[PDB]
Design a protein around this ligand. Structure first.
Ligand SMILES: Cc1cc2nc3c(=O)[nH]c(=O)nc-3n(C[C@H](O)[C@H](O)[C@H](O)COP(=O)(O)O)c2cc1C
Ligand SMILES: Cc1cc(Nc2ccc(S(F)(F)(F)(F)F)cc2)n2nc(C(C)(F)F)nc2n1
Ligand SMILES: O=C(O)c1cc(=O)[nH]c(=O)[nH]1
Length: 367
């Protein structure tokens, strides 16, 4: 609640009004890189703890993929009050992505559309960035117990998809607390192949190193990274159940629901635009998708929420629907740096008013 946050949020609101989106994004990533952004040093409520398997989160809010694609601003973003961040999506080789401008935002609807095109510095350089962070994390009190996942994907013109992801794992898998596979860009038999192949590569990292785990997994968990998969919402009920089966057969560690959507036409400033939409308008679509997969998987696979989360209320819908954890993106654009502090406040208070003992008790409370 400091003036630090408050003053910065004025600057951001101003930037939001006048300056191009991707230009704004990079500007504040830069400010974070030089560590002049504010901190949230509050103790988080132990009643809003959560986990995905043996992967524990000190609080249920993190940042989604695509926000810090190259892992350049990991400390500063985590210290805003987030329990974790998902970097990437990265590819084995650097990409430029599509032509600019490629990101636009509608303020009134609190929505965004993008056709970035998986721009990133490539797996090699980003791994060097994550390593440097991991080294800083050993020295910084505030980064303890904070989780860093890595989103991985295939190059535009890939020879083979699996091989792209395989390279990324070999390079960066040691520094990741979990690995996110996203097949959501704006047959199931080919998916199962991918998922398995990823678990095997991770399992191979363990086998082919002589070191014990403490000195092998240079991450937070000190164990091999979990395997999540991120799904787009533009599928039919048949696709979803077909996939739902796969995730069970592979015994995947969690699923990130969801990515952006192409099926929104009622945003006026966006009618000229191609890409995937995110923000408020994605909220209701996203939540429904969680109920479905939660049902289709019969509640065996943990879920990670993404799509139009702005408030402690929005967060609770995802949780009761079946999510264990939430990711923010659009909220930070429209609500600023206070988003983590603010949303954690709002959620803690609601859990009380809704008579919940803790957050885990509320997970999947939509029958
Ligand atoms: C500019 C931009 C870039 C994104 N890049 C990625 C990405 O690289 N990988 C990914 O899985 N999701 C990416 N996303 C999607 C977000 O991770 C998130 O799923 C989506 O924005 C919905 O969250 P929200 O409604 O809170 O904004 C991107 C979104 C935006 C707006
Ligand atoms: C004012 C503004 C800010 C912003 N992103 C953003 C906002 C805040 C921060 S941060 F991380 F201030 F501490 F929270 F630096 C980092 C990135 N974006 N991102 C975009 C976009 C949609 F182009 F990606 N437009 C923006 N406009
Ligand atoms: O980089 C992108 O263009 C992108 C990737 C993704 O997974 N989702 C999205 O909305 N954009």
């Amino acid at each position: 609640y400091n003036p630090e946050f408050f003053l910065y949020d004025i600057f951001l609101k101003f930037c939001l009004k006048y300056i191009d989106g991707e230009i704004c994004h990079d500007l504040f990533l830069l400010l974070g890189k030089y560590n002049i952004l504010p901190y949230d040093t509050s103790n988080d409520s132990i009643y809003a703890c959560t986990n995905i398997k043996h992967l524990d989160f000190i609080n249920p809010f993190g940042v989604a993929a695509g926000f810090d694609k190259n892992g350049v601003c990991i400390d500063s973003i985590l210290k805003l009050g987030f329990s974790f961040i998902e970097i990437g999506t990265i590819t084995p080789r650097g990409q430029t992505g599509n032509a600019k401008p490629r990101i636009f935002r509608d303020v009134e609807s609190r929505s965004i559309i993008n056709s970035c095109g998986f721009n990133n510095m490539g797996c090699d350089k980003v791994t060097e960035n994550l390593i440097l962070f991991r080294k800083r994390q050993e020295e910084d009190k505030l980064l303890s117990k904070h989780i860093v996942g890595v989103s991985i994907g295939k190059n535009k013109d890939t020879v083979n998809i699996v091989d792209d992801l395989k390279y990324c794992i070999n390079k960066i898998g040691r520094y990741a607390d979990y690995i996110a596979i996203n097949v959501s860009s704006p047959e199931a038999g080919k998916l199962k192949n991918i998922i398995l192949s990823v678990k095997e590569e991770i399992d191979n990292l363990e086998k082919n190193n002589i070191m014990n785990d403490e000195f092998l997994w240079f991450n937070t968990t000190k164990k091999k990274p979990l395997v999540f998969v991120k799904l787009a919402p533009d599928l039919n009920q048949e696709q979803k159940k077909e996939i739902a089966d796969v995730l069970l057969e592979t015994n995947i560690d969690g699923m990130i629901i969801s990515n952006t959507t192409t099926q929104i036409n009622d945003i006026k400033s966006f009618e000229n635009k191609k890409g995937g939409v995110s923000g408020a308008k994605l909220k209701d679509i996203s939540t429904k998708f969680i109920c479905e997969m939660y049902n289709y998987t019969n509640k065996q696979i943990p879920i990670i929420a993404s799509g139009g989360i702005f408030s402690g209320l929005d967060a609770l819908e995802k949780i009761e629907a079946g999510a264990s954890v939430c990711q923010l993106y659009s909220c930070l654009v429209f609500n600023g740096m206070k988003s983590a502090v603010q949303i954690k406040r709002e959620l803690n208070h609601l859990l009380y008013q809704r008579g919940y003992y803790n957050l885990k008790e509320a997970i999947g409370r939509k029958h």
